[model samples]
Target: TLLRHEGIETVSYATQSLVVANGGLGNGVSRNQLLPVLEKCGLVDALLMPPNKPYSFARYRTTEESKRAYVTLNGKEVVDDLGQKITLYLNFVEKVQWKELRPQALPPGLMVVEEIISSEEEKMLLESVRRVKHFGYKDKPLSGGLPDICESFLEKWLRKGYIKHKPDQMTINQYEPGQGIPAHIDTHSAFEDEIVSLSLGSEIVMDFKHPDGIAVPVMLPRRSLLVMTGESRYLWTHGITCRKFDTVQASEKSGIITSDVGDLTLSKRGLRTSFTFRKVRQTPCNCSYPLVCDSQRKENLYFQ
Candidate 1:
């Protein structure tokens, strides 16, 4: 019945291996933690925990031991690595299907540094969150330039080699729960090659979409810095989906979300403010992706 519900093939009679549901990495069950529980049943021959799935296959040395595991371990209660109590459901399978899984990589020239700023620094930056358009604009200085607090940060970033260019334009924006911006590529002519942003106050998942229809959701933890350049900045569209909760790894805080279904859980959104810095382009962009480049493309299109 469980196999039928989940669309998995099963054997009627007992086999040397049993599929243990709710005992997968996606379920937040680590190998070290689950192996001990399964070992109590018998001498285990093999335990295959596929990445991102909610179930694992356990093989015993003998069919008798496998049968014992099926009888005694079925519907067994165990504590996961997250300290959450969960029940394990066991079912007989003819064989373990060893499907190939590919680990997704972050886009090119895109980097996220966790906790780049200390908590105290985050508070200081948050307090100083405000911006004005600085380049190519001859105004009455309606806004008194960039915030004085950011000067030290820019200096430090350049010194540390986090950024190659000194950004002349800054944009500050805040989002409450359930707020987001539509996916978009920044205007090529308006900004230079590198665009950097700081995530402050809360963690959020930002989605990036490639031209080939592959979308990767990345977790931007609080106090982290996100730098976009090359392919990531020029070819892909980045946006935050408007939602109150995000599906993420149960025990992990940051990085790309992939097929790790066992550790998946819902993360609630919170108040977040972002400090985005970019150098206004003084010359036409000569990037490789001319189809999406404003300066290289002849036809004008809109981005939101």
Candidate 2:
């Protein structure tokens, strides 16, 4: 009926009707179910399916120049000079190298770092967390072995002008029980370009927010790499919602974890540790603000 109403007659009506009646209609249906049924019924000889395109956050090396220029020209300039000044003011910031940050066998202009830590490495990181004063399962800054990786990642970004390596270029933090970073944007004015995050141990739901408040949930798997750049970094806000036991759902409508008295399975919540790396752009006194350094200004700082 649907096909007829739409004036589509090339498809076999008997096959379409049977498929629809069996509640196996539409492209969303599983290929396993549809393909077997069609082949068994002699509707098809064999299936030719297109390959799935995998998504990664790795930055491409060849397009680094073009990507950097695009970022700078988009009004999110890298504060190279101010970054130098910040280094002079804060004595702790150190320089990082670009090549050391690139992942093996990955393209450039992509900013994702996946499988950053091994199981043995995770074990050591977990032990380090135990020694911390207060520890909770949430995204925090870099520490222990995680710092070296972060430093290396930052170096590549610094060389590319994606982020600045001032004194105190990196931040170290720990999330205690029930402590979470609410959904918010990073300090782009102070640090424009890309926001690189390295996940050490444990897992957490990192929600990316659209301008209209639509939340796109991404699972920051352990030892995973998350890089947010362009509009995804600047225009959108992101954070980890404070909760334990994330509810995995097959569909968006069925995934809400609430107290409405329904079937809800709990995905165990463990301590999640993350290191968020960004290059904050600092402008000269004459460009944006007239009197003081932009980093020192209240408007430049956002929720950490």
Candidate 3:
């Protein structure tokens, strides 16, 4: 704030730093080393530095721009304004390169566990989802005296705290290129509040739209576990935009450094399948997230 009052701004990452190193600068690789490198690379914006470190914060006008810079400069060697070849290093434990392009929907209830399963586990799960038993049937309360029967599957993720109940339902949706689900909320009366969707075969972007038209994009990376509940389940509407391929800013994260991630494009190699699990809801939803409740709309319009 004091610096901002003096007219400067920067985004801060608490435990991350961009380390600039070069034999030309010897041990004292200060701002003299990194700042000029950043400037020559078209990054003459506000930056913050630690008290006595050979590194600084890599910030831009937005996280997107910062991410682009991170993609372009994470491991590439570049010449600084001082005519020195410097290597840039980001102090991240996972050396993440973003593998997919997707926007995030707003919520406190959305959680993710990336690359949650191994190659073998993923293959087995995919096979299980592909078997002839994968089809879903809609059987709203039958007219007979007996209740409708539903199938059950083994969900390793739900074995813990994420899902408290034994799941009685699953969805096996297949999509070709240029296919997607329209923006819609889950049938509130049809399923329980906590739901999990696991992606397989390929990755894609899913969007969650607010009623007023603002939409959030979240990447559904393959082999990842995503849980939706509370506000994200009952309040927001989710869907995918139809397109053959997604133009993503590919980085050193969860996606591939494919043909056209940044300045490139990659074809979706195969079909996309989503394994969604849910518990059956037995009664009406008396949810506290009233702001987005479609069931409690203003039916009593004062004007005729």
Going through the candidates in the order shown, the clash numbers are 6, 26, 15
Off by over 4 Å in 3: 1-106, 129-155, 253-269, 289-304
lDDT of 2 by residue, 1-304 (tens): 2222222223221121111211111122344543443333333433332211010011112333323322332222122211211110100001111111111221222245557657886666556531223211112352343245445545655666544442224444455444467677655446555566667656566656555433455656676666666666655567765655565543333112322235645566566666555443445222232222333454445522
Locate the minimum summed-lDDT window of 10 residues in model 2: 84-93
Show the lowest summed lDDT stretch of 10 residues, model 1: 130-139
- How many angstroms is residue 246 displaced in model 3 relative to the true structure, after the best TM-score fit? 0.5
In order, what lDDT does every prediction score? 0.79, 0.41, 0.55
How much RMSD separates candidate 3 from the native structure? Answer: 15.6
- Rank all candidate structures by their lDDT, best first, as comma-separated numbers: 1, 3, 2
User: Compared with the true structure, what per-residue lDDT tens digits does model 1 show for residues 37-71?
Assistant: 88887899999987756778899888888888889
lDDT of 3: 0.55
Off by over 4 Å in 2: 1-112, 125-168, 249-265, 284-304
Give the number of the best model, judged by TM-score: 1
Backbone-clash count (model 2)? 26
